Amino acid sequence: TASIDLQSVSYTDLATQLNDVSDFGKMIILKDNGFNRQVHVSMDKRTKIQLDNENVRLFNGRDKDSTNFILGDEFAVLRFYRNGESISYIAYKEAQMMNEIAEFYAAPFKKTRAINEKEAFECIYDGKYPVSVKINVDKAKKILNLPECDYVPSEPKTVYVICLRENGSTVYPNEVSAQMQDAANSVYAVHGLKRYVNLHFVLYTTEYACPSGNADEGLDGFTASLKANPKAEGYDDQIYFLIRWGTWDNNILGISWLNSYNVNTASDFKASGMSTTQLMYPGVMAHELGHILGANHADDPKDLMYSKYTGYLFHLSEKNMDIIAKNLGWEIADGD
Amino acid sequence: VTASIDLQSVSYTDLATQLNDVSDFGKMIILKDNGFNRQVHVSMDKRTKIQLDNENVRLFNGRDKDSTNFILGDEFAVLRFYRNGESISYIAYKEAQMMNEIAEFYAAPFKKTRAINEKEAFECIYDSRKYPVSVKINVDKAKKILNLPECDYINPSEPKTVYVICLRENGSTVYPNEVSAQMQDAANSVYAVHGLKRYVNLHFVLYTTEYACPSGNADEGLDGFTASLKANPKAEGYDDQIYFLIRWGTWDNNILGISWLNSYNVNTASDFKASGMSTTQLMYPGVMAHELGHILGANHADDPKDLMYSKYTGYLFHLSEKNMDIIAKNLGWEIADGD
Ligand SMILES: C[C@@H]1CCc2cc(F)cc3c(=O)c(C(=O)O)cn1c23
Ligand SMILES: C[C@@H]1CCc2cc(F)cc3c(=O)c(C(=O)O)cn1c23
Ligand SMILES: C[C@@H]1CCc2cc(F)cc3c(=O)c(C(=O)O)cn1c23
Ligand SMILES: C[C@@H]1CCc2cc(F)cc3c(=O)c(C(=O)O)cn1c23
Ligand code: PRO
Ligand code: PRO
Ligand code: PRO
Ligand code: PRO
Ligand SMILES: [Cl-]
Ligand SMILES: [Cl-]
Ligand SMILES: [Zn+2]
Structure with missing residues (x-):
């Protein structure tokens, strides 16, 4: 029943769902243009991360899900695979930082002007300023060339x-x-x-x-x-x-x-x-x-x-x- | 070899590095001050979850006999323990501007009423090697000093x-x-x-x-x-x-x-x-x-x-x-x- 809409996913959407993941795990539905992927998400209890003392938590799907998440106070990441290609949804909490990150990732694509830019890179809204960015790293590298x-x-x-x-x-x-x-x-x-x-x-x-x-x-x-x-x-x-x-x-x-x-x-x-x-x-x-x-x-x-x-x-x-x-x-x- | 917290200079970084090292099996931490010592076995609180405006806040517990708890967020850390039936908190904010604002906020009620032993109720803590790195508040002593x-x-x-x-x-x-x-x-x-x-x-x-x-x-x-x-x-x-x-x-x-x-x-x-x-x-x-x-x-x-x-x-x-x-x-x- 819990779900993440990939057409409007923001930091708040990712944080509220991931912060609800208890010791026993939680099913979360990833929804994309009418197609859904049910993932059993669990807290990663093996790895600890601090970036300049800021705590960062990791989350895993099952082996068959090939899905991972990252959650800090300032940002959240969803990463999964489609046709073997790595796709990341990156969402920063603060409006200024999300705007700066969206411009940072968009700038290389503005030098060129590929007809299929959306499948490699996309600003996600929900709608004046973006709430996240989608990057398919395999597609991006072929466009940017x-x-x-x-x-025991x-x-x-x-x-x-x-x-x-x-x-x-x-x-x-x-x-x-x-x-x-x-x-x-x-x-x-x-x-x-x-x-x-x-x-x-x-x-x-x-x-x-x-x-x-x-x-x-x-x-x-x-x-x-x-x-x-x-x-x-x-x-x-x-x-x-x-x-x-x-x-x-x-x-x-x-x-x-x-x-x-x-x-x-x-x-x-x-x-x-x-x-x-x-x-x-x-x-x-x-x-x-x-x-x-x-x-x-x-x-x-x-x-x-x-x-x-x-x-x-x-x-x-x-x-x-x-x-x-x-x-x-x-x-x-x-x-x- | 045992991890320790020096309460004469305890900062946000001191509390965060020690508490971030607490694994599933817990960790011994010695609390030190002038005339004071307490070895506490610290554990992650795995039962309670806290978000404040979506900022994650983690809790830590000592054993029942340790009478000690901790709080850790990205922006602040708290150590709270009981000594001779009195609740003592060490509050440390990560950012210098926020720590200065918090120290002034807690000091203001005392500046109006100057008591002789104000130090035992309220004290700005500074680094050993100048702005405060934390504040110490003994709530039971503070109530007797303030009207x-x-x-x-x-x-x-x-x-x-x-x-x-x-x-x-x-x-x-x-x-x-x-x-x-x-x-x-x-x-x-x-x-x-x-x-x-x-x-x-x-x-x-x-x-x-x-x-x-x-x-x-x-x-x-x-x-x-x-x-x-x-x-x-x-x-x-x-x-x-x-x-x-x-x-x-x-x-x-x-x-x-x-x-x-x-x-x-x-x-x-x-x-x-x-x-x-x-x-x-x-x-x-x-x-x-x-x-x-x-x-x-x-x-x-x-x-x-x-x-x-x-x-x-x-x-x-x-x-x-x-x-x-x-x-x-x-x-x-x-x-x-x-x-
Ligand atoms: C995970 C979902 C969205 C975030 C959320 C925030 C909150 F304050 C309460 C609940 C909440 O109560 C809930 C539930 O169904 O038990 C699910 N969520 C909550
Ligand atoms: C004390 C902590 C762990 C060891 C360490 C190795 C190192 F090469 C650099 C740092 C270090 O730069 C640091 C800091 O707080 O800035 C803390 N540590 C360091
Ligand atoms: C808990 C203590 C202080 C913080 C700290 C930072 C770090 F980068 C490395 C270590 C660290 O390696 C350590 C240890 O003895 O294994 C203890 N601490 C560390
Ligand atoms: C959706 C989440 C949980 C339920 C909830 C009850 C309420 F009275 C206020 C809020 C609420 O204010 C809020 C927010 O994001 O600002 C989110 N939730 C709320
Ligand atoms: O995650 C959120 O709710 C806001 C929206 C834009 C930037 N961060
Ligand atoms: O906790 C720290 O490292 C610094 C010192 C004063 C303000 N925060
Ligand atoms: O009132 C109670 O329940 C506790 C137990 C016995 C006396 N005090
Ligand atoms: O304190 C109380 O209310 C209970 C009643 C019997 C004695 N202890
Ligand atoms: Cl003390
Ligand atoms: Cl002991
Ligand atoms: Zn009552």
């Missing part, structure tokens, strides 16, 4: 993922949260790893900025900045990401220290990386987190760890899944 | 979700730390009785209403409020929930609140009958809990330490077995179910 971007314990162990907003960079909370949600879900999807780890993401600003466009030099400087940062004292065994909106030289989406995190030996800020957070490249943080957990490049073009950027968000390599799970305390005898 | 007038009252497999819809009266200003403290105390007064968390989970929401009491009279004010709910198009389909009109202040004759007695039953709730009005000011904790008590059928108790005592006392729990049975039965409980 962007450059080709390249690359009784309680689970809490692992912090400390994300640091690069000096001078602007990141958008819906985009950063989507990267974090996809990264955490890429780990829990492997060998029942929610039994071993619960990921806690935090976002702060750092004084560090990459000294050039080079990703390799940038990561050397970032890891060195962590060792000299007085705020990071006592946290050398956590996972770190330098984040920005943009990419590095040669359209590199991110970079990280391979096989640098193990639950028993983590130290000296070794488990560090850098990642873009822009909406058009989902799964970059997930790919770099996989690399930090020991995953190598995979040969399946549908693998999250494929050498080229693909848009796929899950580990498919059995060798990588075993390496990642073993680094988080799992053993074959434990099962899935 | 306040005597405010009183008029002489299942899954729990059921019950919404408590609080409406900010037109022309009133309420503070989020104050409203949340009233809601937390009200919900905890219910769960403390007959294991009622098995039957009900309270979900508080706060919106603004166009309604304003036509006079200072509480009886007339409640008549108008219940009538405004029946005429409110936003309330259509929600006549079986619980409602409160809230303000900062009090009504005529220093009346703290008012409500329709025995107006909520999980099986027959309807026509906006389960409605009341409540002050939310910090100096009168438990007013919403007392009015929610009346709506659930609790009568005046004779013990001066009961939440339901006819006069305002500051106590936050039902002690009357007769009232506890009436309240629990109205929420679906039976004696055979046990506690």
Whole structure:
């Protein structure tokens, strides 16, 4: 009976429905031009997120629903798939911020003028100012013709993922949260790893900025900045990401220290990386987190760890899944 | 190695980073101050939900022997604990402008009446390494320093979700730390009785209403409020929930609140009958809990330490077995179910 109308979905519509999701879950109907999708929504109790101390909650549908939600005080996201394409509904609470976000996402499409712009990008009203935006990331990338971007314990162990907003960079909370949600879900999807780890993401600003466009030099400087940062004292065994909106030289989406995190030996800020957070490249943080957990490049073009950027968000390599799970305390005898 | 909160410099960031680290299994946190120490086992309150104008507010509990509660929103944090029978709150707002405004708001009643030991009742807390990072208020000591007038009252497999819809009266200003403290105390007064968390989970929401009491009279004010709910198009389909009109202040004759007695039953709730009005000011904790008590059928108790005592006392729990049975039965409980 509860429902979300995709022709007029606002922050208030998403917040009132998601805030009613109790421990037992709730059925919510997604309604789109007379066609409906019933989703069983549950609170994500494994991942915690703060962005500059602002609490962000995640929600999951069933496996067959391929639907996830994000909810903060300032914004809400609905993300699902249609013909394998990623579709996001992004809604900001404040009128000024929603207007700014709608202009930010509309601007690239105004440079070009595609006849099918509505299916890739659309401002949603309900009607002078928009209440949300709809973006089909797969369709948007083909219209914009962007450059080709390249690359058992009784309680689970809490692992912090400390994300640091690069000096001078602007990141958008819906985009950063989507990267974090996809990264955490890429780990829990492997060998029942929610039994071993619960990921806690935090976002702060750092004084560090990459000294050039080079990703390799940038990561050397970032890891060195962590060792000299007085705020990071006592946290050398956590996972770190330098984040920005943009990419590095040669359209590199991110970079990280391979096989640098193990639950028993983590130290000296070794488990560090850098990642873009822009909406058009989902799964970059997930790919770099996989690399930090020991995953190598995979040969399946549908693998999250494929050498080229693909848009796929899950580990498919059995060798990588075993390496990642073993680094988080799992053993074959434990099962899935 | 044990996590700790230094009450001589406690800020919003200190409280948020500690409370955001509380997982499903709980966490030990040491509360420290000059001549004071308390180890508390903190847990997330998974029974109560709160939105204030759609802003999510989370509650945290200590063990019964810890006598400690917390509140955490994106904009503010509260630590409240009892020490030598006195309620002490540490209130910290995230934004510097809002923290400065809140510190001035709480300091203003004291500046008029300069008492010798004002520090034990009210104190602006500053960072150790200048604007305040939090305020400390001992309500019991504050009442003895201030010349306040005597405010009183008029002489299942899954729990059921019950919404408590609080409406900010037109022309009133309420503070989020104050409203949340009233809601937390009200919900905890219910769960403390007959294991009622098995039957009900309270979900508080706060919106603004166009309604304003036509006079200072509480009886007339409640008549108008219940009538405004029946005429409110936003309330259509929600006549079986619980409602409160809230303000900062009090009504005529220093009346703290008012409500329709025995107006909520999980099986027959309807026509906006389960409605009341409540002050939310910090100096009168438990007013919403007392009015929610009346709506659930609790009568005046004779013990001066009961939440339901006819006069305002500051106590936050039902002690009357007769009232506890009436309240629990109205929420679906039976004696055979046990506690
Ligand atoms: C989830 C839905 C919309 C938001 C909402 C706000 C509120 F104050 C009360 C209710 C509410 O009472 C409800 C229900 O059917 O029990 C459903 N919702 C509510
Ligand atoms: C103390 C907290 C966790 C560790 C940490 C690592 C780091 F590199 C930067 C920060 C950091 O910047 C921060 C802050 O409040 O701004 C808090 N932490 C940091
Ligand atoms: C709860 C405490 C202070 C806040 C905090 C921020 C953060 F980014 C990382 C940690 C953190 O890693 C930690 C720990 O010991 O595991 C404790 N805290 C952290
Ligand atoms: C729809 C939601 C729950 C029911 C409700 C009762 C009421 F008396 C006032 C409001 C109400 O004012 C409101 C809002 O968004 O402003 C939402 N709800 C209300
Ligand atoms: O979510 C809402 O209700 C408003 C409408 C536009 C921006 N935010
Ligand atoms: O909580 C904090 O970190 C800051 C300090 C004063 C205002 N808020
Ligand atoms: O305080 C009361 O009301 C109950 C009645 C008997 C003694 N205790
Ligand atoms: O009045 C009551 O019910 C509690 C229990 C016995 C005495 N006081
Ligand atoms: Cl104290
Ligand atoms: Cl103890
Ligand atoms: Zn009374």
